[PDB]
């Protein structure tokens, strides 16, 4: 096929000389086979804190500093967490609007379940923190 195609993970295609598959520099990785150059590891700095170490074979995986939660794919960015019974607004955490609720550190206030719409009485009213608990069918 190509010379450079059983090149294992942790290595790249080299020309200058007698190495086909030379290993990756430090702070670089290639999980592929035959790569042309090794990718430079992700740095987890500031808001982010390194969860997994960087390796020749696999990239470093970013965690997200306590107070924040991981967001998007691969922890692309880091969003501030509120307590339950709040959602994060433009200005910062705010209490849920009356008749909405949120039971998580992250996320948006959702509205209470309407029990009548599903044909049940209410067993327990909701709070900012907690949903409604529908009871049985009436009558």
């Amino acid at each position, epitope marked *: 096929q190509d010379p450079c195609s059983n090149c294992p993970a942790g290595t790249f295609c080299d020309n200058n000389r007698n190495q086909i598959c030379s290993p990756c520099p430090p702070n670089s990785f290639s999980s592929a086979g035959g790569q042309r150059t090794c990718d430079i590891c992700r740095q987890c700095k500031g808001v982010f804190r390194t969860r997994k170490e960087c390796s020749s074979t696999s990239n470093a995986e970013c965690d997200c500093t306590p107070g924040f939660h991981c967001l998007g794919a691969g922890c692309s960015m880091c969003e501030q967490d509120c307590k339950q019974g709040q959602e994060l607004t433009k200005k910062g955490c705010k209490d849920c609007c009356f008749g909405t609720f949120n039971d998580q550190k992250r996320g948006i206030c959702r509205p*209470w*379940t309407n*029990c009548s719409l*599903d044909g*049940k*009485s209410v*067993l*327990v*009213n909701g*709070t900012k923190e*907690r*949903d*409604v*608990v*529908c*009871g*049985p069918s009436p*009558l």
Partner: nanobody
Amino acid sequence: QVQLVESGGGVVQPGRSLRLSCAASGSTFSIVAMGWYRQAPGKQRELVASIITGDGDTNYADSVKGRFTISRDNSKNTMYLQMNSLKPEDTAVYYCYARTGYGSSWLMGHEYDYWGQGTQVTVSS
């Protein structure tokens, strides 16, 4: 999955107290919230008190605010209703009720709800 047994019914003069017990059995982790319902002959089923097993919040009916107390004990896997200052109107069949989810949701392998047999509570002098 869940069985509920009532205890502690009986007859009492007005103003005396009584304490209902509802013992849960089997898949008790399924239970989220519980309550007491009562049914008088002629009138409709009335919710008396409810409770969140987790956090322990209670809802009472106006007609018993102040007089009744609903409580829970996870160790004994039981729910209590303390009924003080009983009135003629309190006379009804008390059913114990249990739910397995929030809103109208229920836990995958279990029942949306469960009931007990009911105990009779009579107040005449």
